[PDB]
Amino acid sequence: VEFLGASASEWINGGIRILPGDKGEMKASYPLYANLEKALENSLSDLPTTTVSLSAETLPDVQAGSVVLYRKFEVGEVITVRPRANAFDIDLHIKPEYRNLLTSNSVFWAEGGAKVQLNGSGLTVQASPLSRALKGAISFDNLSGASAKRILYASETAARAVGGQITLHAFDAGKLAVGMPIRYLGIDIGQIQTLDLITARNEVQAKAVLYPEYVQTFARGGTRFSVVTPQISAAGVEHLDTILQPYINVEPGRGNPRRDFELQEATITDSRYLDGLSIIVEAPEAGSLGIGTPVLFRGLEVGTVTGMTLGTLSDRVMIAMRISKRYQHLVRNNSVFWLASGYSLDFGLTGGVVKTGTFNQFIRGGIAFATPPGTPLAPKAQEGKHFLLQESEPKEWREWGTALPK
Amino acid sequence: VSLSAETLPDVQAGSVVLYRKFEVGEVITVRPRANAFDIDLHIKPEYRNLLTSNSVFWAEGGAKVQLNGSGLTVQASPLSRALKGAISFDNLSGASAKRILYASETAARAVGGQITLHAFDAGKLAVGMPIRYLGIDIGQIQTLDLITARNEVQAKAVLYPEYVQTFARGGTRFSVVTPQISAAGVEHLDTILQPYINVEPGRGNPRRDFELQEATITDSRYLDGLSIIVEAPEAGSLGIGTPVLFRGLEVGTVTGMTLGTLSDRVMIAMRISKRYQHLVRNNSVFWLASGYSLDFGLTGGVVKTGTFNQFIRGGIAFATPPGTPLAPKAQEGKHFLLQESEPKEWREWGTALPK
Amino acid sequence: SNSVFWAEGGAKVQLNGSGLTVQASPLSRALKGAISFDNLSGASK
Numbered sequence: 001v002e003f004l005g006a007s008a009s010e011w012i013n014g015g016i017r018i019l020p021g022d023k024g025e026m027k028a029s030y031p032l033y034a035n036l037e038k039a040l041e042n043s044l045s046d047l048p049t050t051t052v053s054l055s056a057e058t059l060p061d062v063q064a065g066s067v068v069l070y071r072k073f074e075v076g077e078v079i080t081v082r083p084r085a086n087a088f089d090i091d092l093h094i095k096p097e098y099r100n101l102l103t104s105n106s107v108f109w110a111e112g113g114a115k116v117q118l119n120g121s122g123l124t125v126q127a128s129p130l131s132r133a134l135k136g137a138i139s140f141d142n143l144s145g146a147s148a149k150r151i152l153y154a155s156e157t158a159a160r161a162v163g164g165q166i167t168l169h170a171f172d173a174g175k176l177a178v179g180m181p182i183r184y185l186g187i188d189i190g191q192i193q194t195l196d197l198i199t200a201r202n203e204v205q206a207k208a209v210l211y212p213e214y215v216q217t218f219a220r221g222g223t224r225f226s227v228v229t230p231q232i233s234a235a236g237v238e239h240l241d242t243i244l245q246p247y248i249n250v251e252p253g254r255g256n257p258r259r260d261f262e263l264q265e266a267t268i269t270d271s272r273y274l275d276g277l278s279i280i281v282e283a284p285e286a287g288s289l290g291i292g293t294p295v296l297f298r299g300l301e302v303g304t305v306t307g308m309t310l311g312t313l314s315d316r317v318m319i320a321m322r323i324s325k326r327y328q329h330l331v332r333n334n335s336v337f338w339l340a341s342g343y344s345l346d347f348g349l350t351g352g353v354v355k356t357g358t359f360n361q362f363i364r365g366g367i368a369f370a371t372p373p374g375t376p377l378a379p380k381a382q383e384g385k386h387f388l389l390q391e392s393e394p395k396e397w398r399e400w401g402t403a404l405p406k
Numbered sequence: 407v408s409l410s411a412e413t414l415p416d417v418q419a420g421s422v423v424l425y426r427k428f429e430v431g432e433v434i435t436v437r438p439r440a441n442a443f444d445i446d447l448h449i450k451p452e453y454r455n456l457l458t459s460n461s462v463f464w465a466e467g468g469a470k471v472q473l474n475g476s477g478l479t480v481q482a483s484p485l486s487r488a489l490k491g492a493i494s495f496d497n498l499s500g501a502s503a504k505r506i507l508y509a510s511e512t513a514a515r516a517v518g519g520q521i522t523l524h525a526f527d528a529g530k531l532a533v534g535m536p537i538r539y540l541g542i543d544i545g546q547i548q549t550l551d552l553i554t555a556r557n558e559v560q561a562k563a564v565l566y567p568e569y570v571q572t573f574a575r576g577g578t579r580f581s582v583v584t585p586q587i588s589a590a591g592v593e594h595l596d597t598i599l600q601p602y603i604n605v606e607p608g609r610g611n612p613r614r615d616f617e618l619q620e621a622t623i624t625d626s627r628y629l630d631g632l633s634i635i636v637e638a639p640e641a642g643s644l645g646i647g648t649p650v651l652f653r654g655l656e657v658g659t660v661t662g663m664t665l666g667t668l669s670d671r672v673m674i675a676m677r678i679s680k681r682y683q684h685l686v687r688n689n690s691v692f693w694l695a696s697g698y699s700l701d702f703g704l705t706g707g708v709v710k711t712g713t714f715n716q717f718i719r720g721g722i723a724f725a726t727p728p729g730t731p732l733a734p735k736a737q738e739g740k741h742f743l744l745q746e747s748e749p750k751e752w753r754e755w756g757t758a759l760p761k
Numbered sequence: 762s763n764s765v766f767w768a769e770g771g772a773k774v775q776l777n778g779s780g781l782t783v784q785a786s787p788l789s790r791a792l793k794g795a796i797s798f799d800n801l802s803g804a805s806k
Contacts, residue, residue, distance in 0.1 A: 004686075007586045029651075041760050049588075059425060059426055059427040060426050060427065061427070061483060061484055063429065063484070063486075081428065081540055083428070085540065088426070088428065112481050112482075112483055112484065113481065113482050113483050113485065113488075114481070114482040115480070115481055115482075115486045116475045116477060116479070116480040116482070117477055117480075118478045119476055119477030119478075120477070127482075131483060133482070133484070134484055134485050134486055135484055135486070136484055152456050152752070169541070171626060171627045172541055172624065172625070172626070173540055173541035173542060174538075174540075174541035174543075174596075174624070176541065187741060191695060192520065195542070197539070197540055199540040199569070199572050201625045202627075202629060202630075204539075204540055204542065230592060230595070231588060231591065231592075232587075232591065232592045233590060233591050233592075234589040234590075241475070243595065244474055244475040245471070245474065245475025245476075284653070284753045284754075285653050286653055286654025286655050287654050287711060287712055288712040289715065310653075310655070313757055313758045313759065313760065314652075314653075314685060314758075314759045315756045315757065315759070316756075317653055317654070317655065333620045341710075341712050342711030342712045342713065343709075343710070343711050343713075344707070344708065344709070344710050344711060345708070346707070346708055347702075347706065347707030347708070348706075349704070349705050349706075354518070356529075362711065363713060365712060365713070378516050416786070417785070440800070467780060467782070468780070468782070468783055469780065469781040469783065470780060471776065471780045473780045480781060599778045600778070665783065
């Protein structure tokens with residue numbers, strides 16, 4: 001609360017106040033300022049000079065007199081809004097002392113009034129400037145790839161979306177949304193920016209952006225994208241943060257740049273078997289195998305099933321699996337692979353003994369392997385090697401005890 | 407401007423009139439009538455060119471509540487327009503097919519062709535329920551009415567003008583999606599608060615009169631392939647969405663089940679993918695792989711389990727016997743007989759199927 | 762002749778799946794109260 005202009009003695013006296021200076025030449029004419037603020041700002045006009053012009057399609061919670069915020073700090077104000085053509089033109093003023101705060105790369109996103117948020121950390125009441133809660137705010141900041149007029153966006157995340165552009169094809173957009181984050185190893189590297197249904201080709205095309213730091217590393221062909229969903233069953237619960245905030249997991253690939261991908265169903269969210277051998281096993285039938293099925297050596301998980309497909313002639317099923325770097329030496333040319341899926345037991349006519357082990361093979365039926373004994377060891381398997389899946393477990397694999405160095 | 411409204415949603419004298427959230431003029435007055443409210447408004451002459459024959463009007467609310475990964479966020483909007491109130495208006499395309507003041511933006515946006523659905527129960531239906539194809543909104547239910555003579559509920563809905571011709575062609579299926587929580591897993595959880603209706607398009611003459619179904623394939627990836635028929639004495643565990651497996655790999659789904667003209671067999675219509683269309687030949691054997699099957703010996707008993715989805719949705723498998731001359735590929739309409747048991751040596755056949 | 766009367770209290774804050782409704786538009790209602798009325802069919806002091 002302030003009482004400016006004139007005090008009681010000043011009101012009964014009136015007149016003109018002089019603000020002295022330091023050095024001058026005593027020029028003839030002088031300007032007269034309406035009030036103290038204009039004199040301090042050295043503004044002799046009612047409307048301040050325009051500094052920034054922005055074009056927006058709509059007018060989200062902004063009007064004349066709304067604040068302009070740089071990281072939630074009051075810098076300047078909004079002078080006017082005009083209906084130019086079809087896109088509303090917004091002109092904004094900033095203080096000269098802060099006029100150095102903007103550059104060629106600058107994004108603008110508007111905020112509405114009072115924002116009350118209740119999360120696991122606590123409660124945030126974002127209503128600090130009263131003029132913001134009454135009129136609105138236009139936060140601004142500088143970016144890197146913004147050059148690749150300026151558009152006023154609706155959210156900070158919409159403004160931050162810069163980088164290369166890719167297209168994904170999906171059979172269903174039920175699990176997709178605009179602004180859905182793209183995460184590699186739990187770190188955001190991308191963002192979906194639009195969705196479009198196509199009626200001719202019965203699919204949905206989603207356009208997304210990869211950030212400039214990761215555009216070259218990914219988008220190289222063989223890259224897999226998958227939407228993660230919560231998994232609640234009697235066996236257990238796996239993902240629960242995706243109830244409210246689902247995302248997309250990415251498995252990188254190697255090859256020529258592609259920039260056209262399609263949405264998959266499952267993807268290995270490990271990236272720890274990526275450096276090892278990628279071998280192929282041929283089986284007559286798929287069975288319980290799937291993506292993410294563990295590979296077990298002596299009951300210890302050493303690899304996962306990367307994928308399943310058919311041959312050029314559809315007479316067998318080819319299963320591509322990757323082994324770890326540490327356990328890479330365990331695979332030899334003469335190695336036997338068999339299928340350990342579910343529970344298997346043998347019943348005798350005179351003696352019947354059964355055993356259970358609550359294995360994950362009754363959830364994801366795994367594949368086991370072993371090496372027959374022999375004094376000269378066969379050479380280690382190369383990158384591309386094909387094995388035949390045995391229909392049954394070898395009888396004396398537990399008593400083999402082959403010595404595998406390194 | 408003079409507008410007629412049935413109710414008075416959050417609007418009074420002195421409220422603002424907004425064109426794309428821009429202050430243009432102000433409401434003048436509201437007069438009640440025994441069933442309605444006549445509202446008089448005034449726009450500035452300089453903006454009097456902003457309206458045409460096609461123009462929709464709606465009212466705006468106050469706080470907006472969003473539940474997401476950041477929690478519950480409530481935006482209270484600027485308090486000036488919130489305290490005064492605001493009647494928002496905009497231009498549309500099919501609004502011509504006086505003007506009615508609606509209560510919500512979505513109610514005003516509902517334009518296009520009109521269709522009628524017949525349901526045995528309206529418990530899962532609601533006014534304003536979205537209609538979605540492949541997760542994209544194409545329609546909206548606008549009213550519900552119980553009929554006591556014909557024991558049913560008639561729901562009138564609107565299809566948007568971009569999709570009215572593509573759908574509503576006969577053979578189109580509508581189904582309400584519901585959450586599925588079991589010990590096996592959870593499938594849909596967004597329908598706890600926002601249920602919708604899934605649509606499977608069809609081909610044929612325009613119909614514009616449909617009925618609500620119970621299940622619908624939410625894939626639209628088997629739509630282009632062969633649609634074959636399998637005849638079985640008994641239905642069993644088969645249903646809509648039951649997978650079809652070749653060598654344990656899913657290549658198709660069961661589209662539907664029905665009976666013949668004479669009720670002596672059950673006909674199951676199923677669709678195969680375009681990629682795996684060449685696997686089906688004239689001499690192909692189909693059998694039923696549902697649940698767990700095991701064989702017990704008098705001297706040796708070996709049993710195996712595989713936690714199959716066949717114990718949730720019992721599938722149908724098929725194979726091709728070996729032979730040097732290959733039979734021609736199956737046509738669009740082909741009938742097969744379901745084998746009562748699995749062939750003994752299908753794993754050792756190894757027929758070479760090109761392409 | 763056919764008219765029903767029901768009363769409402771002060772400010773009503775409601776949070777549902779559609780959003781948030783703040784029913785406190787008349788100040789005298791939030792300070793004193795309101796008595797809403799309408800006409801019916803079978804209503805027949």
